[PDB]
């Protein structure tokens, strides 16, 4: 299997996550003017379009650093929105559910790629 074939599938993986109605509230970086105190609250916005410029941009040496990236955008969500009531934080942990079922063979596919 193919050395470069990650950053397809994880074109495909992002384009699932941007369809859904779960990723409404991550698509794009966090307006300031709607939610003021963000940055009170989280250090290092990430969000999908963002993900997906980078990927785009050839500027993820590896399938590791995208997932830093994802694993961000949902870290800074529960950080951001900790109370288990909120919608938000169960349209996170779904998507995120999704996000880490599809990445795991995306990246055992890599590894093992690294040894041919």
């Known amino acids: 299997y193919d050395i470069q074939a990650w950053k397809k599938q994880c074109e495909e993986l992002l384009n699932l996550i941007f369809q859904c109605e779960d990723s409404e509230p ?3 970086p ?3 003017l709607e939610y003021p105190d963000y940055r009170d609250i989280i250090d290092t916005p990430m969000d999908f379009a963002t ?3 980078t990927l785009e941009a050839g500027n ?3 399938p590791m ?3 830093k990236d994802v694993r961000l955008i949902f870290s800074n969500s529960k950080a951001y929105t900790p109370s288990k009531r909120s919608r938000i934080y169960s349209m996170s942990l779904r998507l995120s559910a999704f996000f880490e079922e599809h990445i795991s063979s995306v990246l055992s596919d890599y590894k093992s790629a ?3």
Do not use: G, T
Request: aromatic letters at 16%; a negative charge.
């Open 26 to 28: 991550f698509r794009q």
């Open 30 to 32: 966090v307006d300031l």
């Open 51 to 53: 993900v997906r410029e």
């Open 60 to 62: 993820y040496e590896s």
């Open 65 to 67: 650093e995208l997932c």
């Open 114 to 116: 690294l040894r041919f």
